[PDB]
Design an enzyme around this catalytic site. Sequence first.
Site, short mmCIF file in Angstrom:
data_model
loop_
_atom_site.label_atom_id
_atom_site.label_comp_id
_atom_site.label_asym_id
_atom_site.label_seq_id
_atom_site.Cartn_x
_atom_site.Cartn_y
_atom_site.Cartn_z
N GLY A 139 0.73 -1.27 0.00
CA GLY A 139 0.00 0.00 0.00
C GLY A 139 0.75 1.31 0.00
N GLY A 140 2.05 1.28 -0.24
CA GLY A 140 2.82 2.52 -0.30
C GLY A 140 2.33 3.46 -1.39
CE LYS A 141 5.48 2.09 -6.72
NZ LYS A 141 5.99 1.13 -5.70
CG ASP A 158 -1.38 -7.62 -3.76
OD1 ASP A 158 -0.52 -6.77 -4.09
OD2 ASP A 158 -1.12 -8.82 -3.59
NE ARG A 163 3.58 -8.83 -0.33
CZ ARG A 163 4.10 -7.67 -0.77
NH1 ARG A 163 3.47 -6.95 -1.69
NH2 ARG A 163 5.26 -7.23 -0.28
CG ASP A 191 -5.21 -13.56 -11.59
OD1 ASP A 191 -4.19 -12.84 -11.54
OD2 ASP A 191 -5.34 -14.50 -12.39
CG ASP A 209 4.62 -1.13 -8.00
OD1 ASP A 209 5.72 -1.35 -8.61
OD2 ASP A 209 4.54 -0.96 -6.75
CB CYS A 264 11.33 -2.34 -7.15
SG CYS A 264 10.44 -3.80 -6.55
C1 LIG Z 1 5.77 -4.74 -5.97
S1 LIG Z 1 4.37 -5.37 -5.13
C2 LIG Z 1 3.30 -3.90 -5.22
C3 LIG Z 1 3.85 -2.79 -4.25
C4 LIG Z 1 2.77 -1.73 -3.91
N1 LIG Z 1 2.17 -1.10 -5.10
C5 LIG Z 1 3.38 -0.68 -2.97
O1 LIG Z 1 3.87 0.33 -3.49
O2 LIG Z 1 3.31 -0.90 -1.75
C6 LIG Z 1 3.73 -6.48 -6.39
C7 LIG Z 1 2.46 -7.15 -5.94
O3 LIG Z 1 1.85 -7.97 -6.96
C8 LIG Z 1 1.06 -8.90 -6.26
N2 LIG Z 1 0.56 -9.90 -7.20
C9 LIG Z 1 1.19 -11.02 -7.68
N3 LIG Z 1 0.51 -11.65 -8.60
C10 LIG Z 1 -0.65 -10.91 -8.73
C11 LIG Z 1 -1.77 -11.03 -9.58
N4 LIG Z 1 -1.92 -12.01 -10.47
N5 LIG Z 1 -2.73 -10.08 -9.48
C12 LIG Z 1 -2.58 -9.09 -8.60
N6 LIG Z 1 -1.57 -8.87 -7.75
C13 LIG Z 1 -0.63 -9.82 -7.87
C14 LIG Z 1 1.97 -9.39 -5.15
O4 LIG Z 1 1.19 -10.03 -4.13
C15 LIG Z 1 2.67 -8.08 -4.73
O5 LIG Z 1 2.08 -7.45 -3.60
#
Ligand SMILES: C[S@@+](CC[C@H](N)C(=O)[O-])C[C@H]1O[C@@H](n2cnc3c(N)ncnc32)[C@H](O)[C@@H]1O
EC number: 2.1.1.-
Lengths: 338, 112
Positions: A139-141, A158, A163, A191, A209, A264
């Site tokens: 949840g930062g962004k 998500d 998470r 998803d 992201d 990232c």
């Molecule tokens: C880099 S993190 C996002 C960071 C977030 N935007 C932040 O700034 O705090 C990538 C996310 O994609 C999620 N994820 C993985 N596969 C996914 C999917 N098919 N659909 C949605 N989210 C998914 C992961 O659980 C993870 O939290």
Amino acid sequence: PAVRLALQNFDMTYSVQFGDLWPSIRVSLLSEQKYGALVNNFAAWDHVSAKLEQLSAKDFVNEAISHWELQPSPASWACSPNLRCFTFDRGDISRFPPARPGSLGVMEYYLMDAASLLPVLALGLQPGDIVLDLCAAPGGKTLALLQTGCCRNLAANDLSPSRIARLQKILHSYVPEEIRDGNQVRVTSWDGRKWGELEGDTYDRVLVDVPCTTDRHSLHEEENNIFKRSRKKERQILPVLQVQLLAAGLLATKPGGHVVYSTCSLSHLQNEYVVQGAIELLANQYSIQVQVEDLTHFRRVFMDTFCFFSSCQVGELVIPNLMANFGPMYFCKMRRLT
Amino acid sequence: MRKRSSYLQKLGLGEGKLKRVLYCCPEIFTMRQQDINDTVRLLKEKCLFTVQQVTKILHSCPSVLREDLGQLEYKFQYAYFRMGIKHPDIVKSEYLQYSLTKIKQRHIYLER
Ligand SMILES: C[S@@+](CC[C@H](N)C(=O)[O-])C[C@H]1O[C@@H](n2cnc3c(N)ncnc32)[C@H](O)[C@@H]1O
């Protein structure tokens, strides 16, 4: 071991990509990272801003906006507004103290990689936008998207329900109950790849992201490391997932709407190859045209705070440097035309 | 002075090898010989340096006589275990004259 496999894999790949620039990045990834204090606008930002200035920290977003005129449209028309994020000077390694609750029992500021704010800024939220954060946790962004005061509606999604608990913790810590319980914010756990079918052509702004090899985190944490031997297939098919999520984000965008894709990771296979791959998939399979928007003025304005790898073909990349140790942050703005 | 000149000769600091020692460490003629014996003992049996190497250490790094026995042991261990330097290259490079801070600063920077 997984930490060593990650570094081993980055030595092979990133020494080729960055060349003689790779050592300066390598030392930065293996050293303490620099944080920015994103001010909470719900927590009386003027006092927090004044308190953070006492530490010798300065709002890099304001510094950037001031020079928006130097070298088309107001900064507010191009760049998401009301985001105040304090960082210490170039070369300063001071740490911000932990934030505490303030003005409405909400935490005064959120410490984060200052570069993580750039995809949100670059997305260019305007007042009254319907916004989607497809891969939102922790949840930062999402928090930054709310801070703009532009979201008519904000969808935070998500796949991981664990998470999402952290995202709910941040929303409860930072956002008053008035906003987080209403029709302004919606937290889902599903998803993201299925957003083309459910909620197509709905959003004005979409942040994708994506999950990536989290280069810096992969070198610190051994638990849940993507570079573990068992997660070999998951890591190799990662650019497929990233295209699937970006394409889903684009399909949920209204025609004329904008999308920011971000990672990232320093890897071109997760960055430029995903943007090109999703644009092709939509033009062939769905006959939808997607234009990559130029962020050169955006980069040039923010170069004073971050180190960018200017040799990017599509999108922009913040590379970590000891002077400004802001972790790998790739980001590309797009416009859905048809 | 003659009795110390004799101690230093059998220690291998004859043949003009005591030129560098007197410039940096003139205290060697005033020092207690058991404090000098403690330093050679630490290097020979705890750091596994041969007698010929210990003589060269004293000749090129006289500072080790003024060093604490613990600090000097850890400094040696850093080269042998952490950096992976064999006993001859430690002696040849005059590694033990530098501060652990300078050593850590430059080694870890290059490592990362
Ligand atoms: C880099 S993190 C996002 C960071 C977030 N935007 C932040 O700034 O705090 C990538 C996310 O994609 C999620 N994820 C993985 N596969 C996914 C999917 N098919 N659909 C949605 N989210 C998914 C992961 O659980 C993870 O939290």
